[PDB]
Structure 1
């Protein structure tokens, strides 16, 4: 279980439990990525920012 983050090849293996990952894009703009990392589940997404969480590698 591993996940790449914003744009370059930058990937890493996420630890047990945190087998999920994400990439928070800004809803202000269509979906401008700004944050990303290995998680468990998507934190409280805001009205102006969409947290794009998922379970598969590469997905964020």
Structure 2
């Protein structure tokens, strides 16, 4: 699995145990990533933060 990093255009081949890509944004700005990369479990969204997770190459 390859996930896009916070700094484009770089990606990261995820290590064993991280089978998901994720992008972290503020609830009002879906086009401004705050965190972005590989992750093990999808974080639950909150009142201020939205998390988007996916499991294909460069999907986040």
Please state whether the residue corresponding to 1:30 is helix, strand or coil.
Answer: strand
Give the gaps of 5 or more residues in structure 2.
Answer: none
RMSD (Å), alpha carbons: 1.7
- Cα deviations across residues 4-43 of structure 1 (Å, max 9, x unaligned)? 1235211110012202110111113355321112111212
Of Structure 1 and Structure 2, the greater strand share is in: 2
Distance 1:46 1:10, change over 3 A: same
- The answer to whether the Cα contact below 8 Å between 1:5 and 1:23 also exists between their aligned partners in 2 is no
Give the gaps of 5 or more residues in structure 1.
Answer: none
Give me the TM-score of the superposition, normalised by structure 1. Answer: 0.78
- The answer to whether the Cα contact below 8 Å between 1:25 and 1:50 also exists between their aligned partners in 2 is yes
